């Protein structure tokens, strides 16, 4: 088990990307959130099996097929969310 926070940049809005990320977390039953940042970036935060999490980075770094990620940043964490679902957030 592990946890991370990820920040993403590119054409990652107006392409449904937060829903792409939502479904790509759900297809591994990961827990955490995805949100837009008012700065213009997007953010992911997840917890789950570290193989499933790495596979979720492989999903995220692609963007949706409609998107294009042009830069991405990652921080692993060990200060668990303890969540039981994935969510779309805007806080």
UniProtKB/Swiss-Prot annotation:
<dbReference type="GO" id="GO:0003998">
    <property type="term" value="F:acylphosphatase activity"/>
</dbReference>
<feature type="domain" description="Acylphosphatase-like">
    <location>
        <begin position="3"/>
        <end position="90"/>
    </location>
</feature>
<protein>
    <recommendedName>
        <fullName>Acylphosphatase</fullName>
        <ecNumber>3.6.1.7</ecNumber>
    </recommendedName>
</protein>
<feature type="active site">
    <location>
        <position position="36"/>
    </location>
</feature>
<feature type="active site">
    <location>
        <position position="18"/>
    </location>
</feature>
<dbReference type="InterPro" id="IPR001792">
    <property type="entry name" value="Acylphosphatase-like_dom"/>
</dbReference>
<comment type="similarity">
    <text>Belongs to the acylphosphatase family.</text>
</comment>
<keyword id="KW-0378">Hydrolase</keyword>
<dbReference type="InterPro" id="IPR020456">
    <property type="entry name" value="Acylphosphatase"/>
</dbReference>
<dbReference type="InterPro" id="IPR036046">
    <property type="entry name" value="Acylphosphatase-like_dom_sf"/>
</dbReference>
<dbReference type="InterPro" id="IPR017968">
    <property type="entry name" value="Acylphosphatase_CS"/>
</dbReference>
<dbReference type="Pfam" id="PF00708">
    <property type="entry name" value="Acylphosphatase"/>
</dbReference>
């Amino acid at each position: 088990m592990l946890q991370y926070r990820i920040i993403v940049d590119g054409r990652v809005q107006g392409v449904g990307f937060r829903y792409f990320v939502q479904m790509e977390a759900d297809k591994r039953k990961l827990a955490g959130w995805v949100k837009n940042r008012d700065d213009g970036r997007v953010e992911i935060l997840a917890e789950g099996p570290e193989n499933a999490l790495q596979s979720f980075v492989e999903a995220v770094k692609n963007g949706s097929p409609f998107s294009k990620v042009t830069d991405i940043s990652v921080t692993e964490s060990r200060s668990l969310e303890g969540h039981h679902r994935f969510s779309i957030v805007y806080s």
